[PDB]
Design a protein around this ligand. Structure first.
Ligand SMILES: *[C@@H]1O[C@H](CO)[C@@H](O[C@@H]2O[C@H](CO)[C@@H](O[C@@H]3O[C@H](CO[C@H]4O[C@H](CO)[C@@H](O)[C@H](O)[C@@H]4O)[C@@H](O)[C@H](O[C@H]4O[C@H](CO)[C@@H](O)[C@H](O)[C@@H]4O[C@H]4O[C@H](CO)[C@@H](O)[C@H](O)[C@@H]4O)[C@@H]3O)[C@H](O)[C@H]2NC(C)=O)[C@H](O)[C@H]1NC(C)=O
Ligand SMILES: *[C@@H]1O[C@H](CO)[C@@H](O[C@@H]2O[C@H](CO)[C@@H](O[C@@H]3O[C@H](CO[C@H]4O[C@H](CO)[C@@H](O)[C@H](O)[C@@H]4O)[C@@H](O)[C@H](O[C@H]4O[C@H](CO)[C@@H](O)[C@H](O)[C@@H]4O)[C@@H]3O)[C@H](O)[C@H]2NC(C)=O)[C@H](O)[C@H]1NC(C)=O
Ligand SMILES: *[C@@H]1O[C@H](CO)[C@@H](O[C@@H]2O[C@H](CO)[C@@H](O[C@@H]3O[C@H](CO)[C@@H](O)[C@H](O[C@H]4O[C@H](CO)[C@@H](O)[C@H](O)[C@@H]4O)[C@@H]3O)[C@H](O)[C@H]2NC(C)=O)[C@H](O)[C@H]1NC(C)=O
Ligand SMILES: *[C@@H]1O[C@H](CO)[C@@H](O[C@@H]2O[C@H](CO)[C@@H](O[C@@H]3O[C@H](CO)[C@@H](O)[C@H](O[C@H]4O[C@H](CO)[C@@H](O)[C@H](O)[C@@H]4O)[C@@H]3O)[C@H](O)[C@H]2NC(C)=O)[C@H](O)[C@H]1NC(C)=O
Ligand SMILES: *[C@@H]1O[C@H](CO)[C@@H](O[C@@H]2O[C@H](CO)[C@@H](O[C@@H]3O[C@H](CO)[C@@H](O)[C@H](O)[C@@H]3O)[C@H](O)[C@H]2NC(C)=O)[C@H](O)[C@H]1NC(C)=O
Ligand SMILES: *[C@@H]1O[C@H](CO)[C@@H](O[C@@H]2O[C@H](CO)[C@@H](O[C@@H]3O[C@H](CO)[C@@H](O)[C@H](O)[C@@H]3O)[C@H](O)[C@H]2NC(C)=O)[C@H](O)[C@H]1NC(C)=O
Ligand SMILES: *[C@@H]1O[C@H](CO)[C@@H](O[C@@H]2O[C@H](CO)[C@@H](O[C@@H]3O[C@H](CO)[C@@H](O)[C@H](O)[C@@H]3O)[C@H](O)[C@H]2NC(C)=O)[C@H](O)[C@H]1NC(C)=O
Ligand SMILES: *[C@@H]1O[C@H](CO)[C@@H](O[C@@H]2O[C@H](CO)[C@@H](O[C@@H]3O[C@H](CO)[C@@H](O)[C@H](O)[C@@H]3O)[C@H](O)[C@H]2NC(C)=O)[C@H](O)[C@H]1NC(C)=O
Ligand SMILES: *[C@@H]1O[C@H](CO)[C@@H](O[C@@H]2O[C@H](CO)[C@@H](O[C@@H]3O[C@H](CO)[C@@H](O)[C@H](O)[C@@H]3O)[C@H](O)[C@H]2NC(C)=O)[C@H](O)[C@H]1NC(C)=O
Ligand SMILES: *[C@@H]1O[C@H](CO)[C@@H](O[C@@H]2O[C@H](CO)[C@@H](O[C@@H]3O[C@H](CO)[C@@H](O)[C@H](O)[C@@H]3O)[C@H](O)[C@H]2NC(C)=O)[C@H](O)[C@H]1NC(C)=O
Ligand SMILES: *[C@@H]1O[C@H](CO)[C@@H](O[C@@H]2O[C@H](CO)[C@@H](O[C@@H]3O[C@H](CO)[C@@H](O)[C@H](O)[C@@H]3O)[C@H](O)[C@H]2NC(C)=O)[C@H](O)[C@H]1NC(C)=O
Ligand SMILES: *[C@@H]1O[C@H](CO)[C@@H](O[C@@H]2O[C@H](CO)[C@@H](O)[C@H](O)[C@H]2NC(C)=O)[C@H](O)[C@H]1NC(C)=O
Ligand SMILES: *[C@@H]1O[C@H](CO)[C@@H](O[C@@H]2O[C@H](CO)[C@@H](O)[C@H](O)[C@H]2NC(C)=O)[C@H](O)[C@H]1NC(C)=O
Ligand SMILES: *[C@@H]1O[C@H](CO)[C@@H](O)[C@H](O)[C@H]1NC(C)=O
Ligand SMILES: *[C@@H]1O[C@H](CO)[C@@H](O)[C@H](O)[C@H]1NC(C)=O
Ligand SMILES: *[C@@H]1O[C@H](CO)[C@@H](O)[C@H](O)[C@H]1NC(C)=O
Ligand SMILES: *[C@@H]1O[C@H](CO)[C@@H](O)[C@H](O)[C@H]1NC(C)=O
Ligand SMILES: *[C@@H]1O[C@H](CO)[C@@H](O)[C@H](O)[C@H]1NC(C)=O
Lengths: 132, 453, 107, 132, 53
């Protein structure tokens, strides 16, 4: 017809909003990771490295027992030591980048807790299904 | 029931067409020794036995061999492989120099008067201070005159200098196989009367083509495939006079070529670790190399070809065969390779006949050449070292390339002459029953079912 | 211009009655059309889009049909809120035009 | 022995039947995707191409929330604007290629609806689980 | 800025070896004057003034 243009919802440009809005537009970003005689070798190496990165983080997500989903809850409680704050301010005002900068110190500590929690849970439930 | 929701499927059998890079495959038998040969290098993965073929039904597909891929691809591959193989060999720069030459009167028959020249010249030795005097023999088609006294020079000297061929290498072709990677399929049309373009109802799929033997020839085809019903004729637009015509035979014909002459060999030193091979001396009487075919076989084959061809230009017409029109020495004559040598045979005695509506042997002569520039390139020549002892080989004739000459009005008569020259057609004569396609596993369809929460 | 005729010009009926309105075009326009509703004092909004797609949020009692030079809106059961004015608008080549307007009344 | 032969079920050869029968035989094709100086370089390019092709499809199936199965349902309602006909003829007399050429134009929108539908589903479920 | 060479030139070819050519300047036909460049004045002055400010 006449008098109507076209609107899309593209790349990272939604990365200045608050906490709440950004999580609406996750999927598109997740979709943009596998896009597709001495010059060939370097670009081949770059492609191989990209594929390796994708496989690595895919496996890492797989270990935590949340494969195939974009959201996943877990049992590890949240210690107030890292950053007290409170729900309203974090979910209203804080942006993604500053939050990442502010919780950049305690990642390795966090990962192990999830790993061991899953392992123990699976081991426990195995016996329950075994006695069935 | 009427209302419905979308549904998704996976691994649906649908495909389209595209292009991609193929790869090679060779029989393990060749891998058994035979480490010296231009082709058949070890990089090819060993093949596998018991190939399997899957039949399809109710399908119909259109083929067009004229606008086909995977011809230029293998052409480029062959050229690259040749260049790679030719690389590590000694150069031939210092030979460009004036020569002193004379005839050879050693009981030569009259037909060979002035066809061999005995030449001598100067040449540096390993130590740069000294020089020595040497001599050799040559054929008339490799030396030229410049200007009493007599002198001569090489023919390619003013153009370029090229590499002498290494001694221990084999030019014998062997079967090769082509295979496509995963995610692609190769389709073949098994119709025994399909004329090279249009629909085909009977189809099948395979993973690797049958054997292929690379051969270089002009004006004829050797060691090809054999049809099964009758002689067939193919072309893009037969009405146009500017397009070649390919003729494929039904049964083979035999041919014997031979060079009864006898040769020896000699070696000379040029510099540090630089050797050079030159012709030695002749032992006895000398005769021209020549080739033979039968008579009745050729007669009946030509008769059948004419009868089949008659079905396009009306029965009330005349046919006349004529030799090559003329031109350079490379298209005007049938050239071929046998046992590491190169012959040039004059085919004037084979296309000399006419046809109207309603134990003897044919023998023809040939000539020898020693400097070659194939694939119609410039600045790249070669040197063929001589061989010791007589040679003789036997092969099969299986196909022809013809070109129709222009006409005027309806003269109820037509003429044809041999043509060719471009090596693409030689490859095209084989790969006219293969197509390459790509898969598309995804699919979508409506269905009455609805997803549960 | 492309003349658009709305029928009936005005109507009066009780509540809950099943009613129809028709918009006829001067010439064939395919199905590039839409229907808007309005009451005095409030900004107009689009009730039906393309004469075949139900706009999000509208009650299902409204239904739109037709093509070419004849389009129809049907209300299965009238409501007190349905006593409003309507306009069929064409999203075709220039210029832009609007219908005469039809009113619904309580008797 | 003397008359007993062999009859296997091969690669894609069922593409001459109705729209419905072919779906009964799909699994086989799915199990044939990751099969595994100038004269040998191209093999690397071929392998890279194959693995990239497989990974793209894996990701695309993953996003739509149907991973791990061969037949999956959804919630998006079909619209007769895209196509016509009834279930009987569609599933009785047709071929996959015919359907492909039939629905060629309207594909991107049909793809697009699925991810927003899944996102709404996930978002609603998150609050449904979190309210208690 | 406009820059020019007004002189006239010819060309020649010589053979060295097998298929080796080498180009050497030929002769000149007329008088010779020096190649040179030209620019404006007022534009330069005003641009320098703005840069100074
Ligand atoms: C189209 O297709 C036809 C039909 O196949 C084909 O003709 C055949 O070509 C092949 C390939 O050239 C021919 O095989 C050659 O035949 C002779 C003689 O070898 C045979 O006979 C000797 C003596 O009995 C046997 O020992 C030998 O195994 C063969 O049976 C030669 O051209 C080649 O033989 C080499 O090996 C012989 C071993 O004794 C040597 O005597 C001979 O000189 C050859 O050289 C070998 O030694 C050299 C060192 O001295 C070395 O440098 C060489 O690399 C090599 O090892 C070869 O076997 C076959 O006979 C033909 N068939 C007929 C009926 O004529 C056409 O060639 C093909 N068309 C084209 C254009 O190629
Ligand atoms: C192609 O062109 C080449 C150019 O080199 C010719 O080669 C020369 O040809 C002559 C003539 O045949 C060769 O001479 C022969 O040499 C051999 C040894 O003889 C040498 O020593 C004796 C004794 O000192 C000398 O008399 C003689 O001149 C030679 O220096 C033998 O093959 C022959 O000798 C026979 O005759 C002589 C008398 O002349 C007798 O004394 C000998 O006992 C014997 O009977 C003959 O003389 C010469 O050697 C060749 N040079 C090279 C470098 O090879 C080719 O002949 C010419 N034609 C071809 C190849 O067909
Ligand atoms: C040039 O033309 C000649 C004349 O036609 C041609 O000779 C023929 O070659 C074909 C193909 O090689 C022969 O037909 C088949 O060839 C092989 C031979 O092993 C097999 O496929 C067939 O043989 C069967 O029977 C054999 C019995 O000994 C078995 O050993 C074998 O396993 C098979 O069961 C079949 O013969 C054809 O017989 C010859 N004809 C002759 C010699 O008269 C020649 O090959 C052509 N040149 C080239 C390079 O092909
Ligand atoms: C760049 O700047 C330079 C320097 O200012 C400038 O060079 C000038 O070029 C002009 C055009 O050729 C010259 O003008 C000529 O000068 C002499 C003396 O008058 C004569 O050759 C010419 O006058 C007559 O003489 C000819 C007799 O054969 C007649 O054919 C001709 O028509 C005239 O009637 C002519 O005036 C000038 O002298 C130089 N030099 C200067 C300082 O101007 C140049 O053109 C500028 N541009 C470029 C692109 O280089
Ligand atoms: C290899 O090189 C030698 C040495 O240059 C060449 O021999 C020489 O050839 C020249 C040119 O013909 C001769 O020059 C003149 O010869 C006559 C002899 O009567 C006379 O005019 C002069 O005395 C003058 O020297 C020269 O004699 C000759 N030298 C010798 C020692 O023989 C020879 O021709 C070259 N060979 C080949 C095959 O190129
Ligand atoms: C195959 O070759 C034949 C000729 O042997 C081609 O037929 C002729 O093609 C020409 C060029 O396209 C046509 O254009 C013109 O037609 C008229 C009448 O002849 C005239 O203006 C010109 O002389 C010219 O030819 C022509 O109609 C057509 N037919 C004839 C009888 O000449 C044919 O096109 C070639 N290829 C294909 C794909 O058809
Ligand atoms: C191609 O055909 C020609 C013509 O027949 C063949 O030439 C002929 O070959 C035969 C057989 O070798 C020759 O016979 C020989 O003659 C003498 C005695 O006169 C002697 O060398 C042998 O005892 C034998 O009898 C014949 O002379 C020769 N010439 C003719 C005119 O027939 C030629 O051999 C054939 N080529 C091939 C590769 O078969
Ligand atoms: C090209 O050379 C071949 C090989 O010599 C020629 O075929 C061979 O011809 C001879 C002479 O006829 C055959 O020998 C004998 O002939 C008969 C059968 O024809 C019979 O008595 C014996 O079996 C004996 O072999 C020989 O078999 C035959 N070679 C074969 C069949 O492989 C051929 O004739 C030459 N080409 C031309 C055009 O002459
Ligand atoms: C290919 O071989 C054929 C074999 O016939 C050659 O054709 C023949 O060529 C000669 C000239 O070389 C024709 O003329 C004859 O030769 C001389 C000079 O012309 C003279 O004795 C006679 O007046 C006679 O005309 C000869 O007629 C011709 N043969 C036939 C049957 O027409 C042909 O030249 C060879 N081609 C090449 C490129 O060498
Ligand atoms: C191409 O085919 C033509 C037609 O068959 C061949 O011409 C014929 O060649 C023979 C052999 O030279 C001629 O025989 C000659 O006839 C007369 C006496 O009648 C005389 O010139 C000679 O004594 C010889 O017997 C024959 O007349 C001639 N026919 C013609 C011109 O109509 C020609 O040789 C064939 N070319 C080749 C390369 O085979
Ligand atoms: C550097 O070269 C350029 C390009 O040739 C020169 O530009 C030319 O300047 C002259 C003088 O201003 C222009 O001629 C005048 O143009 C208009 C009419 O078009 C009018 O003012 C006058 O009647 C006179 O014809 C000429 O058009 C112009 N050329 C181009 C192509 O724009 C420039 O003067 C040279 N600079 C120096 C410093 O020599
Ligand atoms: C030696 O070869 C030469 C050429 O290198 C021959 O010279 C020509 O021979 C032909 C054929 O006999 C004659 O028609 C020509 O007149 C000869 N001269 C030229 C300039 O071509 C020569 O005949 C051969 N024989 C001898 C004994 O020298
Ligand atoms: C090969 O066969 C095809 C099919 O019969 C011939 O081309 C057909 O010609 C007819 C008559 O003009 C057309 O209606 C068809 O559309 C053509 N089909 C195709 C696929 O081109 C073709 O001429 C034959 N080739 C030769 C050399 O005889
Ligand atoms: C969060 O805590 C800050 C700091 O005590 C306080 O100002 C703010 O009102 C709190 N917000 C809540 C409870 O929503
Ligand atoms: C081919 O078509 C016929 C006729 O519709 C059908 O009966 C048959 O099942 C189809 N498939 C075949 C023969 O594989
Ligand atoms: C040439 O003929 C003569 C005289 O019969 C003979 O002595 C000589 O050996 C022959 N040479 C050759 C190479 O045949
Ligand atoms: C040639 O003869 C055949 C015999 O079957 C006939 O069908 C055909 O029409 C004839 N063609 C002509 C005279 O051009
Ligand atoms: C599908 O619609 C066609 C066309 O109206 C009709 O012939 C056929 O019977 C219908 N099939 C059903 C409803 O199963």
């Amino acid at each position: 017809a006449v008098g109507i243009g076209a609107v899309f919802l593209g790349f990272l440009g939604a990365a200045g909003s608050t906490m709440g809005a950004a999580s609406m537009t996750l999927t598109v970003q997740a979709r943009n990771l596998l896009s597709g005689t001495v010059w060939g070798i370097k670009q081949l190496q770059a492609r191989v490295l990209a594929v390796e990165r994708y496989l690595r983080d895919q496996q890492l997500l797989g270990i935590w027992g949340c494969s195939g989903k974009l959201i996943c809850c877990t049992n590890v409680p949240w210690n107030s030591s890292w950053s007290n704050r409170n729900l309203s301010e974090i979910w209203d005002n804080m942006t993604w980048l500053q939050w990442d900068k502010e919780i950049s110190n305690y990642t390795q500590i966090i990962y192990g807790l999830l790993e061991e929690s899953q392992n123990q849970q699976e081991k426990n439930e195995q016996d329950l299904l075994a006695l069935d | 029931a009427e209302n419905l929701w979308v549904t998704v499927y996976y691994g649906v059998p649908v495909w389209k067409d595209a292009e991609t890079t193929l790869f090679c495959a060779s029989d393990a038998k060749a891998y058994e020794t035979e480490k010296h040969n231009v082709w058949a290098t070890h990089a090819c993965v060993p093949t596998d036995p018991n190939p399997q073929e899957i039949h399809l039904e109710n399908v119909t597909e259109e083929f067009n061999m004229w606008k086909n891929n995977m011809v230029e691809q293998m052409h480029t591959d062959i050229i690259s492989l040749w260049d790679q193989s030719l690389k590590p060999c000694v150069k031939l720069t210092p030979l460009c120099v004036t020569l002193q030459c004379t005839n050879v009167t050693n009981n030569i028959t009259d037909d060979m008067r002035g066809e061999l020249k005995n030449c001598s010249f100067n040449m540096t030795t390993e130590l740069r201070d000294k020089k020595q005097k040497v001599y050799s023999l040559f054929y008339r088609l490799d030396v030229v005159q410049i200007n009493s006294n007599k002198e001569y020079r090489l023919i390619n000297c003013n153009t370029s200098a090229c590499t002498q061929a290494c001694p221990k290498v084999s030019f014998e072709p062997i079967p090769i196989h082509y295979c496509a990677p995963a995610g692609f399929a190769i389709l073949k049309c098994k119709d025994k009367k399909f004329n090279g373009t249009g629909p085909c109802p009977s189809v099948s799929t395979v993973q690797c083509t049958h054997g292929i033997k690379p051969v270089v020839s002009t004006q004829l085809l050797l060691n090809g495939s054999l049809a099964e019903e009758e002689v067939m004729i193919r072309s893009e637009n037969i009405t146009n006079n500017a397009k070649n015509i390919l003729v494929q035979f039904n049964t083979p014909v035999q041919i014997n070529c031979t060079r009864p002459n006898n040769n020896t060999r000699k070696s000379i030193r040029i510099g540090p670790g630089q050797a050079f091979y030159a012709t030695g001396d002749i032992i006895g009487d000398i005769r021209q190399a020549h080739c033979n075919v039968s008579k009745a076989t050729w007669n009946e084959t030509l008769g059948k070809v004419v009868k089949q061809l008659r079905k396009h230009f009306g029965n009330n017409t005349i046919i006349r065969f004529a030799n090559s029109s003329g031109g350079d020495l490379e298209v005007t004559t049938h050239s071929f390779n046998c046992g590491g040598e190169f012959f040039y045979c004059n085919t004037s005695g084979l296309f000399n006949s006419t046809w109207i509506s309603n134990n003897d042997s044919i023998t023809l002569p040939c000539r020898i050449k020693q400097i070659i520039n194939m694939w119609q390139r410039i600045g790249q020549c070669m040197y063929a070292p001589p061989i010791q002892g007589v040679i003789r080989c036997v092969s099969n004739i299986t196909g022809l390339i013809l070109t129709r000459d222009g006409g005027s009005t309806n003269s109820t008569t037509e003429t044809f002459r041999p043509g060719g020259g471009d090596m693409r057609d030689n490859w095209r004569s084989e790969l006219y029953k293969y197509k390459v396609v790509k898969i598309e596993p995804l699919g979508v369809a409506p269905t009455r079912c609805k997803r549960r929460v | 211009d492309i003349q658009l005729t709305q029928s009936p010009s005005s109507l009066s009926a009780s509540v809950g009655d099943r009613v129809t309105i028709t918009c006829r075009a001067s010439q064939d326009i395919n199905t590039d059309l839409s229907w808007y509703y309005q009451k005095s004092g409030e900004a107009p909004k689009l009730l039906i889009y393309r004469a075949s797609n139900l706009q999000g949020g509208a009650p299902s009692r409204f239904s739109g049909t037709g093509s070419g030079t004849e389009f129809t809106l049907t209300i299965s059961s009238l409501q007190p809120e349905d006593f409003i004015t309507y306009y069929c608008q064409q999203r075709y080549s220039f210029p832009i035009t609007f219908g005469a307007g039809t009113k619904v009344d309580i008797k």
